[PDB]
């Protein structure tokens, strides 16, 4: 079993954990106590460790510079599921600064963190890779997640590392220093991860609100959508799928150059509870929905930008003759460079959710990511050039040239993604 180790870093990555792990528990027929619930299905071993007893243990580590995200997750939301010896807690938190997560505070926990990671690594014969789930907003997520990633890559250089980077909103999750942490941490993700998924919370809020225009939803829906997208990305790593069979294949399929690894996603039906009653989603509509504006979890229109890679992973019966006509029917909405064939790959895997006829998710390497980076970079520059809030970072060791370096690296990254636009 090619086993994956999942690490949740920061208050949001931890907030997500109970939704992510409950989906996996139900998907594979395991209860929330780790007990088997009937017949186990899928390659359970890839995400769960088998205990000396009948219990399955999520193969995961929770990291928080304060005590609170972990305390709520392991004591109130999903009791007895997470192993307490795999939880790392600090006391001070991060004061919302990148500087604490990466230079002044979070560094004292690296021996503890790498020790716990090795204990988890030592339990597996065939380790495929790591998934690091983190916010790029707050200092713990923005700071430690790259600190952890670098420590792992220097010890286990042959593994594939994937990050799930969550970009906070400009409204419900906003912060007055968001642009500093976002640029300072993109600068490190650029050299740290092999694959980096970008999920934009503002897209989630407007997409769910659109789907919910007819009803009252639930406040839990925003977290369920964010958690589900990770579960679906990973579906092919858990079931014997004819696609993204392994993390190494995701890397070879989607990332042509070491720096161009930032990926976008699209998902349909977003959540089962959003699409209820008569939901006979025919193979034809599902593929049109996946390139629709209201299914893309980014401020990206596929028609406005250029594709470098595009993989569509469906679940349930999806006849191949339909998938091919749907792709041909994309026309010029899905366009690549003249140095590439229109390398759009699609197929389907096993469905576990008894309420849905079919579903799917896509992974896109598209130039539109550059627009998010430029948006955040412009905000960074307005603040930086007039020293807003820089004293708080300088006080913890961020010599000013550190900010200048991040500024230049991101402008170069934006420039490179837009090369095919010109």
């Amino acid at each position: 079993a090619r086993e994956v180790i999942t690490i949740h870093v920061g208050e949001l990555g931890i907030q997500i954990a109970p939704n992510f792990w409950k989906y996996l528990c139900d998907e594979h027929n395991i209860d929330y106590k780790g007990q088997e619930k009937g017949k186990i299905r899928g390659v359970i071993d890839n995400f769960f460790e088998k205990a000396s007893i009948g219990k399955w243990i999520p193969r995961t580590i929770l990291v928080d510079l304060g005590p609170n995200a972990i305390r709520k997750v392991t004591k109130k939301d999903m009791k007895d599921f997470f192993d307490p010896k795999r939880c790392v807690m600090g006391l001070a938190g991060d004061a919302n600064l990148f500087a604490k997560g990466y230079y002044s505070y979070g560094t004292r926990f690296m021996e503890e963190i790498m020790d716990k990671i090795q204990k988890e690594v030592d339990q597996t014969e065939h380790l495929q890779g790591f998934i690091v789930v983190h916010s790029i907003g707050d200092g713990t997520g923005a700071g430690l997640a790259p600190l952890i990633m670098e420590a792992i890559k220097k010890k286990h250089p042959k593994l594939v590392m994937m990050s799930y980077s969550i970009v906070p909103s400009q409204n419900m999750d906003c912060s007055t220093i968001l642009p500093y942490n976002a640029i300072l941490s993109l600068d490190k993700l650029t050299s740290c991860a092999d694959i980096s998924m970008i999920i934009d919370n503002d897209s989630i809020y407007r997409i769910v609100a659109t789907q919910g225009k007819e009803n009252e939803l639930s406040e839990s829906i925003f977290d369920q959508v964010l958690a589900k997208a990770l579960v679906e990305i990973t579906a092919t790593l858990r079931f014997n799928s004819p696609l993204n069979r392994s993390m190494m294949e995701m890397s070879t399929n989607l990332v042509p150059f070491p720096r161009n690894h930032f990926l976008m996603t699209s998902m349909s039906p977003l959540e089962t509870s959003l699409t209820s009653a008569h939901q006979k989603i025919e193979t034809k509509e599902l593929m049109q929905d996946l390139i629709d504006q209201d299914h893309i979890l980014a401020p990206i229109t596929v028609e406005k930008g250029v594709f470098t890679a595009f993989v569509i992973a469906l679940r349930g019966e999806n006849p191949h003759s339909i998938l091919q006509n749907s792709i041909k029917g994309f026309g010029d909405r899905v366009k690549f460079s003249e140095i590439f064939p229109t390398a759009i790959k699609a197929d389907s895997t096993t469905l576990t959710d008894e309420k849905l006829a079919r579903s799917g998710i896509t992974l896109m390497n598209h130039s539109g990511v550059a627009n998010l980076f430029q948006f955040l970079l412009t905000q960074f520059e307005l603040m930086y050039d007039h020293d807003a809030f820089t004293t708080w970072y300088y006080q913890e060791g961020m010599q000013p040239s550190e900010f200048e370096a991040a500024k230049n690296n991101i402008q170069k990254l934006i420039t490179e993604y837009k090369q095919d636009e010109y």
Binding site: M248, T252, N253, H320, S321, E338, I339, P341, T342
Partner: protein
């Protein structure tokens, strides 16, 4: 004597071969999910090792995938002997370089031990058949190392490869042209014959010639399997006069590097009496040589043939074969030096779903268009070095990527030069 050992490499290789084995078991009279039979017909010894009342297909099943055995039990029952299935540890992520370089010495040694055992249970080796897909990570790189290894251990043995090439219009992965060229370079160097197949051609056939609505790969594999079962009919059903793999290599390959063949069959019938009794050899020949049944993205009626072979099955009249072939010679275009054109054979035993049927193979200069498209896609990506790090950081030098391309171009240039020279070889 003409015993055949099949080698199945990678997921496509196993699914296609699987469909083949289950159709073979229907014609001979064996249970497709058990191997058990009481009363069988034909020469079952060519493809099956019979122990007691169980007919064990002679195949080596190869993957890099961690759980290949369980994945077979779930679809093929107990038809395949688990001792012949070689499992892997990690896998090749659509990267030729992993299947070819970084596969593990032990993985390859086990495959070779299994092959040796299969060739050790034979009075003679009639040939090997490799089933695979050129754009994958194991059916391309590992399948290629296996051809190299097999040909080094058993030179002078006909190897036939059946492989899936990129489709002409849409592509799967961006890396596909790198995997396809290196696979082709090794096919050029090691196969005796290679059958070029692709999915775009097969889908058009599945949608227009089969009655199936919205076909999937499961249905598409029955067209490939039909090509595979018909091409082995004379071997399986004997006959005083017959065709072995060595007859096909001798007759269809005039030069050692021009062995890439097209395949076509008709009628295509799904199990059940859904067919119509056309019963006409003339109609089947007209169809097999048209463009509509060709299983590759090419258009053979506009090219020139170096050689071709036609195998007729069932109660075909000699008189109709002669008239039907006279029509074919008049309508198509052949190169002068090869003056007889064809290899013709008949097998009196009918395919299970039709009284009559025809399979055609041949060397049509048109085939270069498949290779030229692959070449061009590679050249554009290679010039820009997109996704290239995936091959050079896995052991290849730019030199190997360039030499593989050069060999492919040599074959294209040889087919085209011969074809153009041919116009004046008649004056």
């Amino acid at each position: 004597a003409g015993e055949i050992v099949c080698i199945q490499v990678g997921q496509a290789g196993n699914q296609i071969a699987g469909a083949f084995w289950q159709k073979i078991c229907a014609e001979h009279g064996i249970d497709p999910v058990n191997g058990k039979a009481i009363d069988v017909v034909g020469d079952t010894d060519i493809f099956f090792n019979t122990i007691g009342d169980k007919y064990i297909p002679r195949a080596v099943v190869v993957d890099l995938e961690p759980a290949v055995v369980e994945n077979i039990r779930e679809k093929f029952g107990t038809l395949f002997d688990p001792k012949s299935i070689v499992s892997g540890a990690d896998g090749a992520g659509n990267n030729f370089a992993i299947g070819f370089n970084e596969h593990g010495a032990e993985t390859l040694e086990k495959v070779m031990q299994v092959v040796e055992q299969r060739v050790s249970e034979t009075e003679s080796i009639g040939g090997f058949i490799l089933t695979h897909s050129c754009g994958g990570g194991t059916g391309s790189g590992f399948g290629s190392k296996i051809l190299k290894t097999i040909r080094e251990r058993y030179p002078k043995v006909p190897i036939f490869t059946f492989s899936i090439f990129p489709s002409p219009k849409i592509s799967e992965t961006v890396v596909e042209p790198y995997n396809a060229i290196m696979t082709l370079s090794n096919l050029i160097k090691y196969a005796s014959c290679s059958i070029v197949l692709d999915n775009e051609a097969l889908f058009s056939i599945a949608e227009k010639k089969l009655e199936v609505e919205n076909p999937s790969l499961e249905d598409l594999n029955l067209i490939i399997a039909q090509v595979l079962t018909n091409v082995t009919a004379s071997l399986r059903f004997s006959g005083t006069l017959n065709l072995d793999l060595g007859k096909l290599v001798t007759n269809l390959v005039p030069f050692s590097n021009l062995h890439f063949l097209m395949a076509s069959t008709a009628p295509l019938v799904l199990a059940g009496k859904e067919s119509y009794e056309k019963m006409t050899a003339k109609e089947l020949s007209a169809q097999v040589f048209g463009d509509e049944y060709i299983c590759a993205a090419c258009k053979p009626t506009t090219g020139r043939y170096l050689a071709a072979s036609v195998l007729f099955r069932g109660a075909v009249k000699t008189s109709d074969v002669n008239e039907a072939m006279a029509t074919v010679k008049e309508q198509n275009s052949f190169v002068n030096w090869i003056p007889t054109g064809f290899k013709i054979s008949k097998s009196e035993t009918s395919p299970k779903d039709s009284a009559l049927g025809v399979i055609m193979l041949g060397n049509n200069s048109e085939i270069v268009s498949v290779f030229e498209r692959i070449g061009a896609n590679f050249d554009r990506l290679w010039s820009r070095k997109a996704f290239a790090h995936w091959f050079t950081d896995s052991g290849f030098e730019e030199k190997d990527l360039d030499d593989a391309r050069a060999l492919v171009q040599k074959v294209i240039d040889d087919y085209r030069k011969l074809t153009e020279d041919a116009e004046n070889l008649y004056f």
